[PDB]
Amino acid sequence: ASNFTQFVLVDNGGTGDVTVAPSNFANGVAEWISSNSRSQAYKVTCSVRQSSAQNRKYTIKVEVPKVATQTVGGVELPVAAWRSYLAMKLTIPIFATNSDCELIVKAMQGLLKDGNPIPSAIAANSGIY
Amino acid sequence: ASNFTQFVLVDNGGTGDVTVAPSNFANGVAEWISSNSRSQAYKVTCSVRQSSAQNRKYTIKVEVPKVATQTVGGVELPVAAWRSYLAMKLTIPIFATNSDCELIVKAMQGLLKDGNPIPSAIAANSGIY
Amino acid sequence: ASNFTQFVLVDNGGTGDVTVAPSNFANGVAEWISSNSRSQAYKVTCSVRQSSAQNRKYTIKVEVPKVATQTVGGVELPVAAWRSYLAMKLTIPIFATNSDCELIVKAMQGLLKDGNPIPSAIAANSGIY
Amino acid sequence: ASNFTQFVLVDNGGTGDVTVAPSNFANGVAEWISSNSRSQAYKVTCSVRQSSAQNRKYTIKVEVPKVATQTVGGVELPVAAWRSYLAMKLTIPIFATNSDCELIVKAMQGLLKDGNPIPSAIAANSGIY
Amino acid sequence: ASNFTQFVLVDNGGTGDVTVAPSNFANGVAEWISSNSRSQAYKVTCSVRQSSAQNRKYTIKVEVPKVATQTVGGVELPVAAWRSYLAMKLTIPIFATNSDCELIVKAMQGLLKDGNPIPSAIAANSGIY
Amino acid sequence: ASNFTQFVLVDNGGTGDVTVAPSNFANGVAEWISSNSRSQAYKVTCSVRQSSAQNRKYTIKVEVPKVATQTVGGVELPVAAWRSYLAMKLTIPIFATNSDCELIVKAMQGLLKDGNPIPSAIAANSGIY
RNA sequence: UGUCUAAGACUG
RNA sequence: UGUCUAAGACUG
RNA sequence: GUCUAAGAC
RNA sequence: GUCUAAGAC
């Protein structure tokens, strides 16, 4: 099939959507970046490794930028005022069947679904209480 | 506004859903667990702190049990063969407004949305190809 | 001409066949696996590189699960008791034309053809006698 | 029965066939060579060993020559311009039944069947992509 | 999706075309090789890397062989009488947008378009005059 | 006759075209520069030399600028916010006939033809994937 | 383990 | 493990 | 900088 | 090998 396809990272209903596309696979790290200057692009990376003798570990990262225009030496350049970083490590035993893995994906999706505790605290610059 | 409540971690359309409820708040770290023995339960923990001068950092952890061939309430060893661990670290600059954070959340939801590259790879015991 | 596709690894006449599909391409190494947990799956990997000034070398690996008394989706230990490993290394001089290579392939097919010495010995837990 | 028999290594439909025959078993290594001068002969060798306390390892090798006639000191001699080498190691747990082993042989046969990914890449001086 | 695909390196109408195919991607270095004798094959390699804080750098290489037959001692082999080597370095600031990059590419294409100075000098064994 | 003439470096239909013209030929190094502010001009240089007893070597260079306005102390000047640098070395044996050279050129043109791997990666701020 | 001059060599 | 200047760094 | 070319000097 | 790019380190 090939799962290395582009996808919409930030959905704002058809328009204003942040979509990311395959851009590199050098050294076994799959990379996706948005259609911007390398300095303002959204970035996503993924890699898998047989960490232990009986474990596999996924390493996923996402970079969300706050774009801005900076004047350096009298000249304006496209930059990122700052970047937000998401870094997740996922360890799955080799004994996990496909259905066991689907269970993990579903858990991760439920964890961040709108209305639930965590995504609500994050979106309000708050903690859980 | 008081978000430490029970929520659906794994959704299967009402029937067969996995719910996770508050189980500990020691040290300000929110903990949620399913109705199982702690060796077979679904566990979620979350906490925020200012990691540095310019950043705040959320630390979210999830534990998912291997269910295929599982014996409910039994002693399953080795523990490493029956459990998967997710560790997320979200770094957000102190300049991020609620709007900025809402977008960061959407980015995370899009990353794991059903049908996209990352979740499709994980659910199929695969890497990117 | 774009050969990284799914194929039948174990043929049993349509019914009960074992299919192996693309699962990873990190580092340019093609990987195929069956629809199982990685501890019980059939795995195939392949890659070529120039091993020396005069030679190119293909490195092909295969992993086959022990099926008799197997428990699908279960945790089977020790791993060394439930898996067989095949490691092939094919060295081909840079002077070999496509025709030369076609013959090399035929030589490999003949070596393992049903009814010949090598496969007959292996299939019977025997040596040469 | 006795499996140490001659067999056709390269099949070209009755005529032009490269057939190999038993030629030595000294030191536990079974050898087969084609009917040529030792310097231009196709060669096949096989041996089994109880490698681990619970493993058996087969070591198989095939030598495919590119015959040529070389003039050495004004005299012509039958030689091999170069040789292609196939070297495979197969490790099978002692717990593998005969049917488990038949499964391995079938996997190896399917791996090299015409039309499938690997033999196609090899025959075209190509990699998998 | 993937750009590590085979392509036409030399176009001579429909037939006489030189095609190059993916052969290896070790260490972030993509490599394409034409078919038949590796000794007479065309070669193309490509890689990118962050050369500095504000620059990314591409390293493209091409090898064009002069097909010939070598005879020594009465033994002949397919070889390259000699090779022509092309090596290019392309540095692009991280501020470049997709439009800026598309422009850079057009500049490279125009530099080598039939009829222009550089390509015409090379094709005629000449310099600028 | 002369090949030290002006040519279209960047083609954008009829208008929007970047033309480069002969500006200097000191020390066997031919140089072309686009019109207007030298500070925002495109640059191309070319030279050939006998690199060894049997090889001639070309050195082609291109500079693509990012046009911008610099303001310092209220004084503005036409400048290049930054530049993209291309540098290539082409080695060709003295045995190459005009046909061989025409072939080398076609190889360079194909390497950068629209739709192929290298030009497409560069145009999209990407590597090979 | 890797390579090759290939059942013997080399290299960690 | 922790942090960040983020597939590379730092710190135990 | 060259070459025997992702190795090198 | 990089860059501020036929100058350079």
PDB file of N, CA and C in Angstrom, chain F residues 46-115:
ATOM      1  N   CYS F  46      32.030  30.023 -15.642  1.00  0.00           N
ATOM      2  CA  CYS F  46      32.433  28.762 -16.235  1.00  0.00           C
ATOM      3  C   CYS F  46      33.889  28.785 -16.678  1.00  0.00           C
ATOM      4  N   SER F  47      34.571  27.654 -16.528  1.00  0.00           N
ATOM      5  CA  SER F  47      35.961  27.536 -16.950  1.00  0.00           C
ATOM      6  C   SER F  47      36.320  26.068 -17.152  1.00  0.00           C
ATOM      7  N   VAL F  48      37.322  25.822 -17.991  1.00  0.00           N
ATOM      8  CA  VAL F  48      37.777  24.465 -18.280  1.00  0.00           C
ATOM      9  C   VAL F  48      39.279  24.447 -18.152  1.00  0.00           C
ATOM     10  N   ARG F  49      39.827  23.285 -17.833  1.00  0.00           N
ATOM     11  CA  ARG F  49      41.263  23.154 -17.730  1.00  0.00           C
ATOM     12  C   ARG F  49      41.654  21.689 -17.746  1.00  0.00           C
ATOM     13  N   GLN F  50      42.871  21.416 -18.204  1.00  0.00           N
ATOM     14  CA  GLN F  50      43.395  20.058 -18.262  1.00  0.00           C
ATOM     15  C   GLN F  50      43.726  19.735 -16.810  1.00  0.00           C
ATOM     16  N   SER F  51      42.867  18.958 -16.158  1.00  0.00           N
ATOM     17  CA  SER F  51      43.062  18.621 -14.751  1.00  0.00           C
ATOM     18  C   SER F  51      44.141  17.576 -14.528  1.00  0.00           C
ATOM     19  N   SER F  52      44.387  16.758 -15.544  1.00  0.00           N
ATOM     20  CA  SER F  52      45.413  15.727 -15.463  1.00  0.00           C
ATOM     21  C   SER F  52      45.829  15.383 -16.883  1.00  0.00           C
ATOM     22  N   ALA F  53      46.710  14.401 -17.016  1.00  0.00           N
ATOM     23  CA  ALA F  53      47.184  13.996 -18.327  1.00  0.00           C
ATOM     24  C   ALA F  53      46.050  13.524 -19.227  1.00  0.00           C
ATOM     25  N   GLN F  54      45.087  12.814 -18.653  1.00  0.00           N
ATOM     26  CA  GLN F  54      43.998  12.291 -19.455  1.00  0.00           C
ATOM     27  C   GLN F  54      42.628  12.883 -19.189  1.00  0.00           C
ATOM     28  N   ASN F  55      42.566  13.896 -18.334  1.00  0.00           N
ATOM     29  CA  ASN F  55      41.287  14.513 -18.015  1.00  0.00           C
ATOM     30  C   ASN F  55      41.211  16.020 -18.163  1.00  0.00           C
ATOM     31  N   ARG F  56      40.044  16.487 -18.586  1.00  0.00           N
ATOM     32  CA  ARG F  56      39.785  17.911 -18.686  1.00  0.00           C
ATOM     33  C   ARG F  56      38.706  18.097 -17.625  1.00  0.00           C
ATOM     34  N   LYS F  57      38.638  19.277 -17.027  1.00  0.00           N
ATOM     35  CA  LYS F  57      37.672  19.499 -15.969  1.00  0.00           C
ATOM     36  C   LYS F  57      36.966  20.835 -16.071  1.00  0.00           C
ATOM     37  N   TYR F  58      35.639  20.802 -16.006  1.00  0.00           N
ATOM     38  CA  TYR F  58      34.847  22.021 -16.063  1.00  0.00           C
ATOM     39  C   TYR F  58      34.465  22.421 -14.654  1.00  0.00           C
ATOM     40  N   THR F  59      34.341  23.724 -14.435  1.00  0.00           N
ATOM     41  CA  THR F  59      33.926  24.246 -13.142  1.00  0.00           C
ATOM     42  C   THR F  59      32.832  25.274 -13.408  1.00  0.00           C
ATOM     43  N   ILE F  60      31.582  24.869 -13.188  1.00  0.00           N
ATOM     44  CA  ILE F  60      30.433  25.736 -13.418  1.00  0.00           C
ATOM     45  C   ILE F  60      29.891  26.227 -12.084  1.00  0.00           C
ATOM     46  N   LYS F  61      29.507  27.496 -12.016  1.00  0.00           N
ATOM     47  CA  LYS F  61      28.940  28.040 -10.787  1.00  0.00           C
ATOM     48  C   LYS F  61      27.762  28.973 -11.042  1.00  0.00           C
ATOM     49  N   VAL F  62      26.744  28.877 -10.189  1.00  0.00           N
ATOM     50  CA  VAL F  62      25.576  29.734 -10.316  1.00  0.00           C
ATOM     51  C   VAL F  62      25.175  30.293  -8.959  1.00  0.00           C
ATOM     52  N   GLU F  63      24.726  31.543  -8.959  1.00  0.00           N
ATOM     53  CA  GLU F  63      24.289  32.215  -7.745  1.00  0.00           C
ATOM     54  C   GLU F  63      22.894  32.776  -7.969  1.00  0.00           C
ATOM     55  N   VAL F  64      21.934  32.346  -7.157  1.00  0.00           N
ATOM     56  CA  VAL F  64      20.566  32.841  -7.265  1.00  0.00           C
ATOM     57  C   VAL F  64      20.297  33.669  -6.016  1.00  0.00           C
ATOM     58  N   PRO F  65      19.957  34.956  -6.196  1.00  0.00           N
ATOM     59  CA  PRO F  65      19.679  35.880  -5.095  1.00  0.00           C
ATOM     60  C   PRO F  65      18.220  36.001  -4.696  1.00  0.00           C
ATOM     61  N   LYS F  66      18.005  36.393  -3.446  1.00  0.00           N
ATOM     62  CA  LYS F  66      16.665  36.630  -2.932  1.00  0.00           C
ATOM     63  C   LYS F  66      16.578  38.151  -2.840  1.00  0.00           C
ATOM     64  N   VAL F  67      16.007  38.766  -3.869  1.00  0.00           N
ATOM     65  CA  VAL F  67      15.875  40.216  -3.917  1.00  0.00           C
ATOM     66  C   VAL F  67      15.144  40.780  -2.702  1.00  0.00           C
ATOM     67  N   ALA F  68      15.679  41.858  -2.138  1.00  0.00           N
ATOM     68  CA  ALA F  68      15.069  42.494  -0.978  1.00  0.00           C
ATOM     69  C   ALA F  68      15.591  43.913  -0.794  1.00  0.00           C
ATOM     70  N   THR F  69      14.986  44.638   0.139  1.00  0.00           N
ATOM     71  CA  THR F  69      15.399  46.002   0.431  1.00  0.00           C
ATOM     72  C   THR F  69      15.929  46.083   1.853  1.00  0.00           C
ATOM     73  N   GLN F  70      17.114  46.662   2.004  1.00  0.00           N
ATOM     74  CA  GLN F  70      17.725  46.796   3.313  1.00  0.00           C
ATOM     75  C   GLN F  70      17.623  48.224   3.790  1.00  0.00           C
ATOM     76  N   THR F  71      17.129  48.411   5.008  1.00  0.00           N
ATOM     77  CA  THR F  71      17.005  49.749   5.564  1.00  0.00           C
ATOM     78  C   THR F  71      17.771  49.837   6.871  1.00  0.00           C
ATOM     79  N   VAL F  72      18.737  50.744   6.912  1.00  0.00           N
ATOM     80  CA  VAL F  72      19.550  50.945   8.098  1.00  0.00           C
ATOM     81  C   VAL F  72      19.708  52.442   8.320  1.00  0.00           C
ATOM     82  N   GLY F  73      19.328  52.904   9.504  1.00  0.00           N
ATOM     83  CA  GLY F  73      19.442  54.319   9.794  1.00  0.00           C
ATOM     84  C   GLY F  73      18.554  55.152   8.892  1.00  0.00           C
ATOM     85  N   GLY F  74      17.516  54.528   8.346  1.00  0.00           N
ATOM     86  CA  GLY F  74      16.606  55.248   7.474  1.00  0.00           C
ATOM     87  C   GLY F  74      17.047  55.270   6.024  1.00  0.00           C
ATOM     88  N   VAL F  75      18.216  54.695   5.753  1.00  0.00           N
ATOM     89  CA  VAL F  75      18.753  54.649   4.396  1.00  0.00           C
ATOM     90  C   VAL F  75      18.502  53.277   3.795  1.00  0.00           C
ATOM     91  N   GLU F  76      17.805  53.213   2.666  1.00  0.00           N
ATOM     92  CA  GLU F  76      17.566  51.909   2.064  1.00  0.00           C
ATOM     93  C   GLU F  76      18.372  51.644   0.801  1.00  0.00           C
ATOM     94  N   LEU F  77      18.765  50.386   0.633  1.00  0.00           N
ATOM     95  CA  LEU F  77      19.560  49.963  -0.508  1.00  0.00           C
ATOM     96  C   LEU F  77      19.042  48.673  -1.103  1.00  0.00           C
ATOM     97  N   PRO F  78      19.236  48.491  -2.416  1.00  0.00           N
ATOM     98  CA  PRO F  78      18.784  47.266  -3.077  1.00  0.00           C
ATOM     99  C   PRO F  78      19.831  46.210  -2.717  1.00  0.00           C
ATOM    100  N   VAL F  79      19.411  45.119  -2.090  1.00  0.00           N
ATOM    101  CA  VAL F  79      20.360  44.074  -1.715  1.00  0.00           C
ATOM    102  C   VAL F  79      19.771  42.691  -1.935  1.00  0.00           C
ATOM    103  N   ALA F  80      20.569  41.676  -1.634  1.00  0.00           N
ATOM    104  CA  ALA F  80      20.116  40.301  -1.737  1.00  0.00           C
ATOM    105  C   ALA F  80      19.971  39.865  -0.278  1.00  0.00           C
ATOM    106  N   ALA F  81      18.753  39.524   0.140  1.00  0.00           N
ATOM    107  CA  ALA F  81      18.534  39.093   1.518  1.00  0.00           C
ATOM    108  C   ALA F  81      19.495  37.948   1.798  1.00  0.00           C
ATOM    109  N   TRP F  82      19.690  37.097   0.796  1.00  0.00           N
ATOM    110  CA  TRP F  82      20.600  35.962   0.879  1.00  0.00           C
ATOM    111  C   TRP F  82      20.785  35.398  -0.517  1.00  0.00           C
ATOM    112  N   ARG F  83      21.685  34.434  -0.647  1.00  0.00           N
ATOM    113  CA  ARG F  83      21.936  33.821  -1.939  1.00  0.00           C
ATOM    114  C   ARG F  83      21.991  32.312  -1.843  1.00  0.00           C
ATOM    115  N   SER F  84      21.631  31.673  -2.945  1.00  0.00           N
ATOM    116  CA  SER F  84      21.654  30.229  -3.050  1.00  0.00           C
ATOM    117  C   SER F  84      22.861  29.948  -3.952  1.00  0.00           C
ATOM    118  N   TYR F  85      23.739  29.041  -3.536  1.00  0.00           N
ATOM    119  CA  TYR F  85      24.934  28.755  -4.328  1.00  0.00           C
ATOM    120  C   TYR F  85      25.031  27.364  -4.931  1.00  0.00           C
ATOM    121  N   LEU F  86      25.212  27.317  -6.247  1.00  0.00           N
ATOM    122  CA  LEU F  86      25.373  26.055  -6.957  1.00  0.00           C
ATOM    123  C   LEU F  86      26.795  26.004  -7.497  1.00  0.00           C
ATOM    124  N   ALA F  87      27.467  24.876  -7.298  1.00  0.00           N
ATOM    125  CA  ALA F  87      28.829  24.720  -7.786  1.00  0.00           C
ATOM    126  C   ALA F  87      29.008  23.315  -8.325  1.00  0.00           C
ATOM    127  N   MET F  88      29.411  23.184  -9.583  1.00  0.00           N
ATOM    128  CA  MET F  88      29.622  21.850 -10.115  1.00  0.00           C
ATOM    129  C   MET F  88      30.955  21.645 -10.815  1.00  0.00           C
ATOM    130  N   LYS F  89      31.456  20.421 -10.693  1.00  0.00           N
ATOM    131  CA  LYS F  89      32.713  19.998 -11.285  1.00  0.00           C
ATOM    132  C   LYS F  89      32.390  18.849 -12.232  1.00  0.00           C
ATOM    133  N   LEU F  90      32.867  18.941 -13.467  1.00  0.00           N
ATOM    134  CA  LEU F  90      32.615  17.896 -14.450  1.00  0.00           C
ATOM    135  C   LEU F  90      33.930  17.428 -15.057  1.00  0.00           C
ATOM    136  N   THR F  91      34.308  16.180 -14.787  1.00  0.00           N
ATOM    137  CA  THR F  91      35.557  15.633 -15.320  1.00  0.00           C
ATOM    138  C   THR F  91      35.289  14.731 -16.520  1.00  0.00           C
ATOM    139  N   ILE F  92      35.945  15.026 -17.640  1.00  0.00           N
ATOM    140  CA  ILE F  92      35.762  14.252 -18.864  1.00  0.00           C
ATOM    141  C   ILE F  92      37.094  13.844 -19.495  1.00  0.00           C
ATOM    142  N   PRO F  93      37.333  12.528 -19.639  1.00  0.00           N
ATOM    143  CA  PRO F  93      38.564  11.985 -20.233  1.00  0.00           C
ATOM    144  C   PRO F  93      38.799  12.524 -21.647  1.00  0.00           C
ATOM    145  N   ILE F  94      40.062  12.670 -22.026  1.00  0.00           N
ATOM    146  CA  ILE F  94      40.396  13.184 -23.349  1.00  0.00           C
ATOM    147  C   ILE F  94      40.024  12.224 -24.476  1.00  0.00           C
ATOM    148  N   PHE F  95      39.519  11.047 -24.123  1.00  0.00           N
ATOM    149  CA  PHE F  95      39.134  10.058 -25.125  1.00  0.00           C
ATOM    150  C   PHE F  95      37.698  10.240 -25.590  1.00  0.00           C
ATOM    151  N   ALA F  96      36.952  11.074 -24.876  1.00  0.00           N
ATOM    152  CA  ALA F  96      35.559  11.322 -25.211  1.00  0.00           C
ATOM    153  C   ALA F  96      35.408  12.010 -26.562  1.00  0.00           C
ATOM    154  N   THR F  97      34.575  11.433 -27.417  1.00  0.00           N
ATOM    155  CA  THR F  97      34.317  12.002 -28.732  1.00  0.00           C
ATOM    156  C   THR F  97      33.172  12.986 -28.567  1.00  0.00           C
ATOM    157  N   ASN F  98      32.807  13.684 -29.634  1.00  0.00           N
ATOM    158  CA  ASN F  98      31.708  14.632 -29.524  1.00  0.00           C
ATOM    159  C   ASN F  98      30.420  13.918 -29.138  1.00  0.00           C
ATOM    160  N   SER F  99      30.249  12.687 -29.611  1.00  0.00           N
ATOM    161  CA  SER F  99      29.057  11.909 -29.291  1.00  0.00           C
ATOM    162  C   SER F  99      29.017  11.590 -27.811  1.00  0.00           C
ATOM    163  N   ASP F 100      30.165  11.198 -27.266  1.00  0.00           N
ATOM    164  CA  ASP F 100      30.250  10.869 -25.851  1.00  0.00           C
ATOM    165  C   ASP F 100      29.879  12.088 -25.014  1.00  0.00           C
ATOM    166  N   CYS F 101      30.339  13.261 -25.437  1.00  0.00           N
ATOM    167  CA  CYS F 101      30.054  14.489 -24.709  1.00  0.00           C
ATOM    168  C   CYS F 101      28.591  14.890 -24.800  1.00  0.00           C
ATOM    169  N   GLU F 102      27.979  14.634 -25.950  1.00  0.00           N
ATOM    170  CA  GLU F 102      26.573  14.956 -26.145  1.00  0.00           C
ATOM    171  C   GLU F 102      25.743  14.103 -25.199  1.00  0.00           C
ATOM    172  N   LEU F 103      26.225  12.888 -24.962  1.00  0.00           N
ATOM    173  CA  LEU F 103      25.573  11.935 -24.075  1.00  0.00           C
ATOM    174  C   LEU F 103      25.670  12.409 -22.621  1.00  0.00           C
ATOM    175  N   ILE F 104      26.845  12.905 -22.244  1.00  0.00           N
ATOM    176  CA  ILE F 104      27.086  13.418 -20.901  1.00  0.00           C
ATOM    177  C   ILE F 104      26.124  14.577 -20.620  1.00  0.00           C
ATOM    178  N   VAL F 105      25.948  15.443 -21.614  1.00  0.00           N
ATOM    179  CA  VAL F 105      25.047  16.578 -21.477  1.00  0.00           C
ATOM    180  C   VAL F 105      23.606  16.098 -21.297  1.00  0.00           C
ATOM    181  N   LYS F 106      23.181  15.130 -22.104  1.00  0.00           N
ATOM    182  CA  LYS F 106      21.823  14.608 -21.979  1.00  0.00           C
ATOM    183  C   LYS F 106      21.607  14.047 -20.582  1.00  0.00           C
ATOM    184  N   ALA F 107      22.643  13.437 -20.017  1.00  0.00           N
ATOM    185  CA  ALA F 107      22.536  12.872 -18.680  1.00  0.00           C
ATOM    186  C   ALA F 107      22.290  13.990 -17.675  1.00  0.00           C
ATOM    187  N   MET F 108      22.982  15.116 -17.842  1.00  0.00           N
ATOM    188  CA  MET F 108      22.807  16.242 -16.935  1.00  0.00           C
ATOM    189  C   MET F 108      21.432  16.863 -17.070  1.00  0.00           C
ATOM    190  N   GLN F 109      20.915  16.899 -18.292  1.00  0.00           N
ATOM    191  CA  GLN F 109      19.596  17.473 -18.522  1.00  0.00           C
ATOM    192  C   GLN F 109      18.510  16.585 -17.913  1.00  0.00           C
ATOM    193  N   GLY F 110      18.657  15.270 -18.078  1.00  0.00           N
ATOM    194  CA  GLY F 110      17.686  14.333 -17.534  1.00  0.00           C
ATOM    195  C   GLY F 110      17.667  14.349 -16.015  1.00  0.00           C
ATOM    196  N   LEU F 111      18.842  14.523 -15.422  1.00  0.00           N
ATOM    197  CA  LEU F 111      18.966  14.577 -13.977  1.00  0.00           C
ATOM    198  C   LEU F 111      18.090  15.686 -13.399  1.00  0.00           C
ATOM    199  N   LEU F 112      17.947  16.783 -14.142  1.00  0.00           N
ATOM    200  CA  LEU F 112      17.168  17.927 -13.673  1.00  0.00           C
ATOM    201  C   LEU F 112      15.832  18.165 -14.375  1.00  0.00           C
ATOM    202  N   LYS F 113      15.387  17.217 -15.190  1.00  0.00           N
ATOM    203  CA  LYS F 113      14.121  17.387 -15.891  1.00  0.00           C
ATOM    204  C   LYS F 113      12.943  17.392 -14.927  1.00  0.00           C
ATOM    205  N   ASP F 114      11.958  18.246 -15.199  1.00  0.00           N
ATOM    206  CA  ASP F 114      10.775  18.338 -14.347  1.00  0.00           C
ATOM    207  C   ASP F 114      10.131  16.984 -14.136  1.00  0.00           C
ATOM    208  N   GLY F 115       9.836  16.664 -12.881  1.00  0.00           N
ATOM    209  CA  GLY F 115       9.201  15.396 -12.578  1.00  0.00           C
ATOM    210  C   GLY F 115      10.129  14.330 -12.037  1.00  0.00           C
TER     211      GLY F 115
END
